[PDB]
Write a protein that binds this ligand. Structure first.
Ligand SMILES: CNC(=O)c1cnn(C)c1Cl
Length: 125
């Protein structure tokens, strides 16, 4: 029932993602000189260095907010790919399955800790 435990769990999961070869295209913002039509397709860029910096700054309030920004990395790759058989999109699907497998217990534990805190609210003092 530790309400704060999610933060270190997300730092460790981000460490595993940065060691995965499949994350290399997603570690830093897309290079607009290499992909000049990227911002004609994609409204909101996102990358794993931005996610880690936001976490380490203390600018996520919950693991649900981190999970929304990681899912945006994957939805941007699906929107920019010219083919569902492309190299970089194929890497995004494998990394998305690994992330979803690991984030599910982080989210469940956080939500369980908040419910336990609300069961024990103090009203008489
Ligand atoms: C992070 N880069 C991308 O998602 C990207 C670049 N090129 N293609 C085909 C994709 Cl998909």
């Amino acid at each position: 029932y530790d309400i704060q435990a999610w933060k270190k769990q997300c730092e460790e999961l981000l460490n595993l993602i940065f060691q995965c070869e499949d994350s290399e295209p997603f570690r830093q913002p897309v290079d607009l000189l290499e992909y000049p039509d990227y911002r004609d397709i994609i409204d909101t860029p996102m990358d794993f260095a931005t996610v880690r910096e936001t976490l380490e700054a203390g600018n996520y309030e919950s693991p649900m907010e981190l999970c929304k920004d990681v899912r945006l990395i994957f939805s941007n790759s699906k929107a920019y790919t010219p083919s569902k058989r492309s190299r970089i999109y194929s890497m995004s699907l494998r990394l998305s399955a690994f992330f979803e497998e690991h984030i599910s217990s982080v989210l469940s534990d956080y939500k369980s800790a908040l419910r336990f805190h609300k069961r024990n609210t103090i009203t008489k003092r």
